């Protein structure tokens, strides 16, 4: 049994590939392979074109007061 | 023990002054070559020079490989001796230069002192301690001890199904847990338990043993390039997903050099430079020869013995470049050439007699003379190979010794290369291609 | 999942046509690795002996001021991989 | 019903057909003629059986159709299944997974068998009554009792937890004839001494019974484990090696592993634990090996773990593969010096007729004497293999016309329907332009 | 199946019951001698008593070699394995050529497995232990059977089972109203969900509710499964379905063909022999058809000697249209069919001849019938004349362009003018070669 | 703006320029001349559209620059995007990962399209409440803009809901047959005004209509895609990476049978297409031998090929054959020959290229450029079109004149002038 090899390097080397978020764009807008097994044709083709939010709806919901409390169930 | 082609070669048969006795240690001739090999053996034993190359040159059957194995026998089993054939560099996993470099490091051995820490006893308490550690109680015939061990050791104990009453062996260095059996004291409780019982250990619970380990530089390189000592999931993953050899870098070899130098300085390691032997060197190509230039120029390299029976032959990997031994002239400038000669009929008879004695065969003088005559034509190898079939024929006929009739009958049954060549030439139109 | 095999997929029951297509004889002619290990237990106990001359842990990378997120990320990855895969490696215990 | 093994080229060869003095009979065990070659093969077979000399090489050389492979198959059948016999073609060493030297090393090591003999205590009996009491809920110690019976004994065993678990997993019931190995606790069911209760449903059709074992319950039996050096190398190369025993995919085994195995097997041999059973490697068509492979063969035969190597080639003075050098048999002269050569002479008319008779007997084909004469003439004119093929061709033609014996007309019909190399080449010369590349 | 391929008209060898070949039958025209020889080979395959026998179909291109092999396959039927293969396929980036050949050899040997699967289906109506009036040991309750009531669409049956099934019932969590099946050959209980009659429209479970089984409670059937030795070899070399780390690695790693060892193949052979002896399985030795055998190299040809000499090998059919060509992998070695003379000694050669104009006209008419094309007598004669020059393949390839051209012109049959226009539009090999030779400077290389 | 598709060598080709009778117009849809070749291409295109006959091979042969690839692009354009058209070069079958025959098999199976049609019942709504009792049983409330209902959950449904961490406000769909749950988005409320959002969260409107809905999905996949999907456990990943390897033939046979079953059941339709191999002379003899018998399958598309070789050497052999293709394969295919263009055709092609690139040229410039194209090559003149346009724009001109064409002729050399200049200084260049 031998001790492992302790390989020492400069701390700056481990940050060579790191880029600050304010210096890089969002690559998730080109992520096609990440959608497989998670996103369906229904969501992309039928649902989202109909049920996308609009700025008007978002503003109306944000400005409107809280909805009334949901009524308690009644056996009727 | 089976009798191989070189089983009679026990040494170089040299006297105290270095001169070669005529017949000694299973060697009959090649006195000049044996004396040169004695000098090479002294060079290897000096452990001072690095990368010194020797070429054994001569026709086939002149005992080049016998002389290399005799050098091995003179050195002893402690000194590494790596035999490789030139055809073995053509691997489908790593480059030819990598194969050569790995064989170079295999020739350098290292005797290193190591201390093994052992926990051995019957388990009396196995209490997890919340990742969960283990508190274990071990008893022997001399005492009892309680130990706190790492969670990895607890996982190993669980995998071994160790329960209270089992005799276990723990190696603290490698964390290797072995369950040996249920203690013998419980062997009477049942009639069919499906258990293997083991007596109680009779020493102490904790032992320290110092042993000498024989390793090579290649072993260290492999251990640090394909690690399996962490016992973690990543090591298993790397072993299963990457089982092939890899081209170990010069950086790893430099680190191993530093580690071994540190060990030698600490006084716990001894270096044995050792020998590499390449038998069919002409099978290497020009890339291998060019690499061997720089490899032999290294101050870490071992002593390399090369062999060749080729004449003025085209170097493999070149189109039409022809060199004296199949070896480019640049590498021949870096080698000491030991020349082997053809054997006289008397030496052939001596070798035949030695091989007969080695194979446990009694041969009459008339049969020995006839077989030496058979070896004068054809080859010595062919004459030696007729000993066992002739013995089998004599045994079938009820004779305990080989007579001339058995040798004649066997030679009639089996042809040599020249006779087969004559048959092929006479009937070229009937054989394929 | 088992496309083009003598072993049929997991039919829900006899109502499915796959229930009456595959035979147990074809199934018993295919041995899983666990069945192979059970078949070679005596051979494993008697003929598996070769040990590496040297054993070392993997080389470790050390920096004075590393990114403080690299080591915890590697630790979490290793922990998850071990928790998912170590139970599956138990059959290979005797060989190791 | 037809087994997986059917009538092949050498199905009629059951051995070399020699007597005690290794003298070949004219026609015995399928072999006809080739007296000198069969005698040489017998001497080589005795050398193999003695198993004392390592790395012996024999070359069977002759013209096509002279019985080189017949002699090799006769040697294989005379050796028996106890001694390993690895038969490969020269082309098989060219592999994308491993080097040629590695493939040759594996072939060599597949031809040496390591046998471990040990004695173990064994309990074999008829289960009379098995009782297992287990806690209703939660972890607890199962307690059980087992009764085993032979024709002359009956003992009641108190069972431990692990034996209880083994019996539960094997689902051992009364009337089951079981075998128990005391050390490992393995239980193997080998039959039922009688049927299960009839009143039960969904039990299936009951098979035949097995007679109860006699003698004492706990006997001592000799267990023999035999593996080859290649199997040890593969299972020791890596953790997943045992699967590599079936999938191939061994890669290139480290030389360190093989050296350790050689040392351990030598130690076992010295300690009486294991015996080495050297065998034969038969490389058919060795002329497909290149110079690098031949150079490896030269030195690999010098090991004490090397088997007997038998090669077959029908080449004359031919270029060695991978080089531009003409050599006898396509083999370098350095390797030809390390081996004894067994020449096979062509067959005569009577030997050809006897081979045809043996083939007809193997194929269960009845033929007339005139048909035998015509077929022997065709075999002498064309080749032995063509006549052998015509045997079953004419059998099928005769059976089509509701006959019982193959006549000259059937042989002529199949001679017209199926062509040899000579007549095909003539007809191709007649239409040379119609064929594509000349 | 609906699309028409080049050999869609070949329905077998047009052989009389006596083996003589009819002039035109089963889609085949002429080649009477070759067809008779192929019928003898079909009888050889059906006899199932020969192994490793090889047949070489030798003749100029377009002479029915592939058509004859496919006719043999039609004669044998779908029961007999028929593994087509071209010689170029042995060159793989994963396994060696000999391994490809061996795998194709094992694909041709088939195995037919017959088993009876007896099951008891039903919805559990009753689950009642059968106690004994004399409890063993004095205390507690002992049970000797467990009565399970199974209900199906057209019946209801009760099963007095072994007491040991109580554990299986609890492990499967079987209660009343659940649909289960019990296998006689194993004595195990499997819960295939709950009956759908107890499901409400407001439930959201997916695989829990199952329809009440139709038919009888006791279902038994004979299962015929056809497998090949290569299937067993591959399923054992790279097994699928384990839960150990090695199976997980197999699922993760990219699949790759491996060099299956003789050990695994011998084990498969032993298992197959055991099944055959038990009566479970019947061996079905088939045919390996290796088209363009001349594309094999010298290593493949050499390996074929040992492959064919085996007693497990199938009947191999080769096909080559080459003359005195150079064997691949060799430097300037010429053999009569691109095949070394050693392998020619192991094969029976069937010669295919060229077609007379009448046979070409018959084949063109048959191909027109297969493609659903009506062709006039004058157009057929012109197309046969076109086939006398050029080749037969060229003439049969003008049928669909001429039919399309007629349909565009508004006619339901091919007239001579349509064939003339198609012949003007499309060139054959010889006419293109004449153009190339006349303008060799303007072309490349 | 500048889209990813820009002016290429065949951007001016929109079709084969034929009428209803497949008679080629002199200049239509961007094609000039090659009347016989275009008519043959149209006949082959009708054969492709019918789809009845399998494994038909056509070779477009002719001198370099005679419109072979132009005709192939015209066929591809005229053929709808619905019908597959796999265009590969001969060199692309030489792969380090799979054999040549495997590459050709994958290319063949990429040329057959399978259009699937699945109809599935789903539940679609916004999650209002999830109550689980203790996790054996629970209730789920889903709502739309026009409906609201409560569902009783089982063990597997509860486990699936907990695994996906479905909570209130999530808009989800549940497949009735399989029970799989996919999250479409979440509803926006006043309290969900997040400052930071996860990479997958998105706000959607609550669905309207009825909670139970039918989902119909129609998509076109090729046989190669189905092969890759079923090659391994996550084989669809190889449709992005390309690390397919050699797919087992048994898998392909199973998929052929399954596709036939789908076609009988009405769940799939087969659209055989075209495999165009450009510069086939790069194929080796093994590839041609494989092509001979690959075309004989019932699932073989139309193989269109194009070579400009005369009687040359077959790759991998020492034999000479009329197109570099062995005569055995040439008997399996119909040859469409392209003739050299005349002066009028060259001028018309130059006009079409100038219109495509939006370059104005004088008639004298057109005459000079046509003379250059006849003397040197058509492609050289086509390149000079853009060169002269750039030079004209540099001098602030609006129409290319003869001076611009002469200037770019002096600046840029064709092969003949460059070869002459090299021969003048032959010793300067390396390895003559
Ligand atoms: N001088 C010698 N004395 C005894 N045996 C010898 C001698 N030289 C060679 N031999 C034996 O004869 C055989 C041929 O020698 P070898 O070393 O193989 O020749 P090569 O130089 O061709 O390798 C071997 O069995 C070897 O042990
Ligand atoms: N002496 C013999 N006795 C019996 N059968 C023989 C004999 N010689 C050849 N045969 C048979 O004839 C065929 C050709 O012989 P074979 O050994 O294959 O020739 P080769 O020397 O080319 O290998 C085989 O079927 C073989 O079994
Ligand atoms: N005798 C025949 N009867 C009917 N069709 C034939 C006949 N011979 C060839 N064909 C057909 O002509 C075409 C030529 O292919 P084929 O003859 O198989 O070429 P090859 O023999 O060179 O492989 C195929 O469509 C084949 O079905
Ligand atoms: N008939 C045609 N109509 C329009 N453009 C053509 C025509 N023939 C060739 N071209 C154009 O000339 C150039 C070369 O023709 P191309 O078909 O690529 O040559 P090749 O036939 O040698 O492949 C391309 O830019 C192509 O668009
Ligand atoms: Mg042979
Ligand atoms: Mg082009």
XYZ file of C-alpha atoms in Angstrom, chain B residues 1-7 60-61 64-66 69 82-83 85-94 99 102-103 106 160-161 163 166 179 182 189-196 216 218-219 222 226 228 236 239-246 277 279-280 282-283 307 309-310 312-316 355 358-361 378-393 395-397 409-410 412-425 427-428 430-433, chain D residues 20-23 35-37 39-41 43-44 46-48 50-58 61-64 95-101 112 123 141 146 148 156-164 166 180-186 238-240 249-256 259 266 269 276 278-279 291-293 295-296 298-308 313-319 322-323 325-329 332-334 336-344 346:
234
model
C 7.855 -30.891 -13.687
C 7.679 -30.685 -17.469
C 10.932 -30.581 -19.440
C 11.224 -27.536 -21.689
C 13.748 -26.601 -24.385
C 16.187 -24.967 -21.928
C 15.609 -27.027 -18.773
C 19.745 -20.258 -35.351
C 20.469 -23.104 -32.981
C 21.590 -17.286 -27.973
C 18.439 -17.777 -25.900
C 20.246 -20.444 -23.886
C 18.575 -17.757 -19.788
C 11.851 -9.541 -18.222
C 11.708 -11.702 -21.366
C 9.591 -11.010 -27.941
C 9.902 -8.322 -30.593
C 6.448 -9.219 -31.906
C 4.853 -8.168 -28.596
C 5.157 -4.399 -29.153
C 2.299 -4.542 -31.683
C -0.501 -4.134 -29.169
C -4.010 -2.999 -30.047
C -4.301 -1.016 -26.793
C -1.161 1.127 -26.417
C 4.991 -1.235 -24.616
C 6.599 -0.518 -19.749
C 8.940 -3.442 -20.353
C 9.485 -4.057 -15.419
C -18.710 -10.109 4.898
C -21.847 -10.634 7.048
C -21.878 -10.992 13.348
C -17.278 -14.637 14.071
C -14.434 -13.069 7.743
C -17.860 -18.731 13.188
C -24.832 -25.712 19.042
C -26.381 -27.127 15.857
C -26.059 -30.198 13.659
C -26.500 -28.431 10.294
C -25.694 -24.713 10.334
C -24.086 -24.177 6.891
C -21.086 -22.512 8.523
C -17.321 -22.961 8.428
C 8.899 -3.098 -9.893
C 6.007 -0.672 -13.641
C 3.883 -1.887 -10.729
C 0.174 0.982 -12.910
C -5.205 2.885 -12.727
C -7.754 0.799 -7.018
C -14.833 0.606 -9.235
C -12.004 -0.194 -13.414
C -15.248 -1.311 -15.048
C -15.554 1.476 -17.639
C -11.824 1.787 -18.478
C -10.259 -1.693 -18.304
C -7.741 -1.180 -21.126
C -4.111 -0.194 -20.736
C -3.209 3.463 -21.112
C 15.687 -9.455 -22.824
C 14.583 -12.257 -28.258
C 13.344 -11.518 -31.796
C 14.435 -7.995 -35.837
C 10.643 -8.086 -35.434
C 19.131 -11.367 -29.945
C 19.675 -14.641 -36.223
C 19.037 -12.500 -39.301
C 21.823 -8.661 -44.027
C 18.072 -8.148 -43.867
C 15.514 -5.442 -44.573
C 14.518 -3.501 -41.464
C 10.812 -3.813 -40.739
C 19.241 -33.356 -23.418
C 17.553 -34.060 -18.887
C 14.570 -35.900 -20.380
C 15.393 -39.086 -18.463
C 16.322 -41.109 -21.556
C 19.579 -31.499 -40.891
C 20.023 -29.567 -37.596
C 20.861 -30.136 -33.945
C 17.305 -29.135 -33.001
C 15.866 -31.903 -35.181
C 18.243 -34.501 -33.731
C 17.328 -33.518 -30.165
C 13.600 -33.689 -30.911
C 13.870 -37.346 -31.978
C 14.858 -38.474 -28.471
C 11.384 -38.698 -26.928
C 9.692 -40.425 -29.915
C 12.546 -42.939 -30.056
C 12.175 -43.532 -26.317
C 8.443 -44.101 -26.783
C 9.158 -46.607 -29.555
C 9.208 -48.512 -24.497
C 6.521 -49.959 -26.777
C 8.928 -52.685 -27.905
C 12.460 -45.885 -37.443
C 11.667 -42.457 -35.983
C 11.873 -42.604 -41.259
C 8.552 -41.561 -39.699
C 9.455 -37.862 -39.301
C 11.047 -35.617 -41.922
C 13.160 -32.517 -41.375
C 12.887 -29.122 -43.052
C 15.329 -29.960 -45.858
C 13.653 -33.278 -46.695
C 10.250 -31.581 -46.749
C 11.694 -28.865 -48.987
C 12.930 -31.560 -51.373
C 9.486 -33.183 -51.427
C 7.826 -29.814 -52.072
C 10.234 -29.011 -54.907
C 5.900 -32.003 -56.355
C 5.409 -28.257 -56.731
C 0.461 -30.717 -56.516
C 0.824 -28.410 -53.501
C -1.090 -25.158 -53.161
C 0.556 -21.852 -54.102
C -0.789 -51.584 -29.176
C 2.462 -51.318 -31.156
C 1.132 -48.142 -32.853
C 0.874 -50.037 -36.134
C -0.139 -45.682 -42.585
C 3.081 -43.719 -42.042
C 1.244 -40.515 -41.127
C 1.881 -44.106 -37.079
C 3.592 -40.736 -36.617
C 0.351 -39.292 -35.231
C 3.700 -41.569 -31.560
C 2.804 -37.891 -31.117
C 1.674 -41.089 -26.898
C 3.966 -38.104 -26.346
C 0.911 -35.971 -25.529
C 2.759 -38.893 -21.277
C 2.598 -35.124 -20.785
C 6.241 -34.624 -19.817
C 7.787 -32.589 -22.661
C 6.555 -29.033 -23.154
C 6.414 -27.097 -26.398
C 6.608 -29.859 -28.996
C 5.553 -28.884 -32.513
C 4.408 -31.198 -35.312
C 1.998 -31.356 -44.553
C 0.575 -32.776 -47.751
C -1.515 -32.163 -50.813
C -5.162 -31.089 -50.466
C -8.471 -9.699 -33.985
C -9.480 -6.085 -33.422
C -9.692 -6.627 -29.652
C -6.228 -8.051 -28.968
C -2.795 -8.398 -30.511
C -1.732 -11.445 -32.506
C 0.686 -12.420 -29.737
C -3.479 -26.455 -20.591
C -25.251 -35.584 3.082
C -34.176 -16.521 15.169
C -35.004 -31.800 9.493
C -33.308 -37.360 6.424
C -33.097 -35.938 12.788
C -31.001 -32.782 12.404
C -31.260 -29.603 14.447
C -30.933 -26.778 11.927
C -29.156 -23.442 12.149
C -30.426 -20.146 10.793
C -28.345 -20.215 7.603
C -29.265 -23.829 6.854
C -32.886 -22.875 7.516
C -30.959 -22.382 2.426
C -26.160 -31.056 1.318
C -22.509 -30.008 1.379
C -21.632 -29.414 5.021
C -18.995 -26.722 4.470
C -20.748 -24.381 2.036
C -24.309 -25.353 2.948
C -25.296 -25.671 -0.705
C -10.302 -7.966 -13.675
C -13.396 -8.087 -11.504
C -15.687 -8.489 -14.530
C -13.795 -8.957 -24.458
C -10.750 -9.912 -22.389
C -8.614 -7.234 -24.018
C -4.919 -7.848 -23.491
C -4.115 -9.602 -20.224
C -1.158 -8.165 -18.331
C 2.007 -10.251 -18.350
C 2.219 -9.778 -14.572
C 3.496 -14.690 -14.383
C 3.731 -24.341 -10.050
C 1.821 -28.676 -8.363
C -1.567 -29.898 -14.746
C -1.288 -30.423 -20.834
C -3.195 -30.674 -24.083
C 6.106 -13.426 -39.683
C 5.325 -11.723 -36.360
C 3.082 -14.608 -35.302
C 8.338 -15.266 -34.386
C 6.089 -15.428 -31.333
C 9.304 -19.684 -31.944
C 9.754 -18.488 -28.352
C 6.350 -19.326 -26.858
C 7.117 -23.047 -27.285
C 10.116 -22.668 -24.944
C 7.904 -22.345 -21.841
C 7.159 -25.262 -19.534
C 3.464 -24.316 -19.709
C 3.343 -24.674 -23.493
C 1.211 -27.466 -24.984
C 1.867 -29.694 -27.977
C -0.618 -26.787 -44.250
C -0.936 -27.717 -47.925
C 1.516 -25.105 -49.201
C 4.716 -25.740 -51.101
C 7.482 -23.151 -51.326
C 5.327 -20.083 -50.749
C 5.682 -16.460 -49.691
C 3.736 -10.155 -44.118
C 7.055 -10.562 -45.964
C 10.334 -14.250 -48.546
C 9.752 -17.654 -50.122
C 9.919 -20.482 -47.595
C 8.825 -24.124 -47.425
C 5.192 -24.494 -46.325
C 10.061 -19.439 -41.702
C 13.026 -21.784 -41.547
C 13.654 -20.885 -37.894
C 10.639 -25.331 -39.276
C 13.745 -26.379 -37.334
C 11.728 -26.599 -34.092
C 9.218 -29.108 -35.464
C 8.877 -32.600 -36.891
C 7.056 -32.863 -40.222
C 4.566 -35.630 -41.043
C 3.943 -36.023 -44.775
C 0.672 -37.381 -46.162
C -2.028 -39.331 -51.957
